[PDB]
Design a protein around this ligand. Structure first.
Ligand SMILES: *[C@@H]1O[C@H](CO)[C@@H](O[C@@H]2O[C@H](CO)[C@@H](O[C@@H]3O[C@H](CO)[C@@H](O)[C@H](O[C@@H]4O[C@H](CO)[C@@H](O)[C@H](O)[C@@H]4O)[C@@H]3O)[C@H](O)[C@H]2NC(C)=O)[C@H](O)[C@H]1NC(C)=O
Lengths: 388, 145, 49
């Protein structure tokens, strides 16, 4: 019944762990209970990541749920691929094909590409972050030859907080050489807030400018400060709050006490936390399918050290991975289903356009359909056409 | 990781080895905490990392100064993914300070079976801009191809 | 008022704001220092004395 599962979290994860607890409570059936072993450590240090992974492996966990940074991706993938340990993560998906990893976050490169196709952009700026992965930057650079674009990519990630105000202003003064008005920001919401603050300080948020937030956390960051500037802001959101499921979840989320569960009383939830909740759901449904197919998973104890000269990977983990990838459920992120590699297939990413009233669902994208929903105003507000 | 910890358990004083785009993070974080000296002739790490001695010098400034010397304004950049995007990021950041139109293509992830087709399609795609100046950021084994 | 001008983006180049009070330097001016609008004011407490 008690299924020991690993839970590696970064020390800065608060709302994500809160959503992990809410998911642990929501799907704790009497048939079986998932007991998590939580390890809060530094996500960047790959030596501590290796130590925690080998500690969980020595304890005898069936599936590890965690996060990773640009340093830990290779260690986690190469350890789970060889030791046959199931891994679930809401972070960015790995570039290429990687086994024993279930990336809850969907692929956003095609979403940004289809949005550039819809807006018909030919020359723009791309302020990218190094820690968030250069996958999207490589995709848009390769498309810059298929469709021939003049993109100005700048690595804003490597900046110091002491010279922060100086580096950003010098960056935008350098971007005013081409008189760039279209900018895409590939950064995390925490850094996107700083970039937006700097844009407000320099006054480049007026009429004419167009800013695209290249992440699934559009509504998570405060947009009211640029809501009335004049610049048309657009972004992406996976946690659609208009969903009845998401609404019923937020009803309990806001009522939860802020002391026991940090960052829960808010009405808006971060996409990483929602993806953690959905990952807990997927794990629960996977072990439920393992119980339904009478496929016995059992460790009895521990095989030993992860480091060994004869590499000993336990076999039943493959079945766990198969059960994880086979689960198709409905959650906060919409439709959740995985393929043979572990990526998200058949998903729904909503394209939002920040108007004067606030965040407006201007459309939605999928893996098969590009820019579908033409809802509300179909270019019919203030036009003033005089019939002659 | 297994070989590094085997050498550490054996009692080595300084490990001399190599690394790839995947293992670098494992080596730097292991030598930094265990205070073991590491020497490598591979590409230098981006930034400041202790207990690591990179025998290879920095080539980004050399390519940048050569582009300044040749006075190039529009060219192509065929880069390798395994060799590290450090040079590609350096030339992309300089493409705004000195204003260049660079067309970067990731030729690193290609299969040996479809090699001749992918390369011919890449050069046919590069004739749209009629590019005559190309920079190849690849290893000698791939540069020969 | 300066915060509201910043929110609407009317502190860019072209605009000219004159603060009609003897408290120019006591209030924080760094928020509109880089907007572009030429701000002018009056000060009775000269700190250079
Ligand atoms: C709703 O969701 C359905 C299931 O999630 C989905 O049906 C899927 O449709 C896609 C495309 O039509 C199928 O994708 C193929 O997958 C098979 C393997 O399962 C392959 O032929 C191929 O991928 C291969 O595998 C690797 C992928 O990286 C790659 O290395 C290989 O070279 C090769 O590309 C296709 O990608 C998928 O199988 C279907 N799922 C199922 C369960 O049949 C619906 O289309 C979707 N509908 C909407 C409207 O979103």
């Amino acid at each position: 019944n008690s299924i020991q599962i690993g839970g590696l979290f970064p020390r800065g994860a608060d709302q994500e762990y809160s959503a992990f607890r809410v998911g642990m409570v929501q799907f704790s059936t009497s048939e079986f209970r998932l007991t998590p072993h939580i390890d809060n450590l530094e996500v960047a240090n790959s030596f501590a990541v290796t130590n925690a992974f080998c500690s969980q492996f020595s304890r005898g966990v069936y599936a590890i749920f965690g996060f990773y940074d640009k340093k830990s991706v290779n260690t986690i993938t190469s350890f789970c691929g060889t030791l046959h340990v199931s891994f679930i993560t809401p972070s960015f998906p790995t570039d290429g094909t990687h086994p024993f990893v279930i990336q809850m976050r969907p692929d956003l490169k095609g979403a940004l590409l289809s949005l550039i196709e819809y807006y018909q952009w030919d020359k723009f700026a791309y302020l990218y972050d190094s820690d968030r992965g250069l996958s999207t930057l490589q995709a848009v650079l390769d498309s810059a030859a298929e469709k021939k674009w003049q993109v100005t990519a700048i690595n804003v990630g490597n900046i110091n907080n002491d010279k922060k105000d100086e580096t950003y202003r010098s960056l935008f003064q350098d971007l005013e050489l081409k008189k760039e008005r279209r900018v895409i920001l590939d950064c995390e919401r925490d850094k996107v807030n700083d970039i937006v603050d700097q844009v407000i300080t320099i006054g480049k948020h007026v009429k004419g400018y167009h800013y695209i937030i290249a992440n699934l956390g559009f509504t998570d960051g405060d947009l009211l400060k640029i809501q009335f500037g004049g610049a048309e802001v657009s972004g992406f959101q996976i946690v659609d709050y208009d969903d009845s499921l998401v609404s019923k979840f937020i009803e309990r989320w806001s009522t939860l006490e802020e002391k026991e569960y940090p960052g829960a009383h808010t009405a808006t939830i971060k996409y990483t936390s929602a993806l953690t909740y959905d990952a807990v759901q997927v794990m629960t449904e996977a072990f439920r399918n393992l119980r339904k197919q009478r496929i016995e998973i059992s460790r009895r104890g521990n095989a030993g050290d992860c480091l060994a000269n004869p590499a000993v990977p336990w076999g039943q983990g493959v079945e766990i991975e198969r059960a994880l990838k086979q689960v198709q459920v409905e959650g906060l992120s919409g439709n959740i289903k995985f393929d043979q590699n572990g990526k998200r297939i058949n998903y729904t990413i909503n394209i939002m356009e920040l108007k004067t009233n606030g965040p407006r669902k201007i459309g939605y994208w999928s893996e098969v359909d590009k820019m579908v929903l033409t809802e509300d105003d179909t270019s019919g507000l203030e036009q003033k056409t005089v019939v002659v």
